[PDB]
């Protein structure tokens, strides 16, 4: 499922993401936008280390979800990577919460540093009613 901007905004808010561990809703929106373009079935294989990024938040198979084919994998979120490809993003949100719960925070996603950090991110939630 490819989410519409405000539709996603309200969903994340309902799922308790606004201000989770200091991360504003606008920041989560900026992250989802650049990671997958609000697409829940987005997958990205990293040929370099044999891991795959899954779902709307492009969560990595080496540490957060288990896909069985990633070498040296650990399952920190303890979910099947398949759960992160659903239209319902409850599990993807729970995995995202687990990721930022680690010392790097939102910085864990390099895309956030490149395209969201130190920028005006209000535009991602503007007009959405959140």
Question: How long, in residues, is the chain?
Answer: 130
Contacts of 16 (CB under 8 A, 6+ apart): none
Domain boundaries, the chain: 1-130
Round to the nearest angstrom and report the end-to-end CA distance of the chain: 21
Q: Token pair of 26, please? A: 């606008």
Distance CA 34, CA 36 (A): 6
Phi-psi region of 38 (alpha: psi -120 to 50; beta: other; left: phi over 0): left
Helices (H) and strands (E) in the chain, counts: 4, 5
Distance CA 30, CA 36 (A): 10
| Assigned fold of 1-130 | Lysozyme (1.10.530)
Q: Token pair of 86, please? A: 């659903």
Contacts of 26 (CB under 8 A, 6+ apart): 121, 122, 124, 125
Q: Token pair of 85, please? A: 């490809």
Residues 79 and 59: beta-carbon distance below 8 Å? no
Burial of 60 (0-12, 13-18, 19+ CB in 10 A): buried
Q: For this experimental structure, what is the resolution in angstroms?
A: 1.8
**β-pair partners for 54:** 43, 59
Method used to obtain the model: X-ray
The 10 Å CB-count burial string (b at 16+, else e) for 93-113 is: bebbbbbbeeeeebebbebbe
Distance CA 60, CA 70 (A): 10
Of 87, 95, 21, residue with least CA distance to 53? 95
Q: Token pair of 84, please? A: 């992160």
Provide the annotated active-site residues: 35, 53
């Amino acid at each position: 499922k490819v989410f519409e901007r405000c539709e996603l905004a309200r969903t994340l808010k309902r799922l308790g993401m606004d201000g989770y561990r200091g991360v504003s809703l606008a920041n989560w929106m900026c992250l989802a936008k650049w990671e997958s373009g609000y697409n829940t079935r987005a997958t990205n294989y990293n040929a370099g280390d044999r891991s795959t990024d899954y779902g709307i938040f492009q969560i990595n198979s080496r540490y957060w979800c288990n896909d069985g084919k990633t070498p040296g994998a650990v399952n920190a979120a303890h979910l099947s990577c398949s759960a992160l490809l659903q239209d319902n993003i409850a599990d993807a949100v729970a995995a995202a919460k687990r990721v930022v719960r680690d010392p790097q925070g939102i910085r864990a996603w390099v895309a956030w540093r490149n395209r969201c950090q130190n920028r005006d991110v209000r535009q991602y939630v503007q007009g959405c009613g959140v």
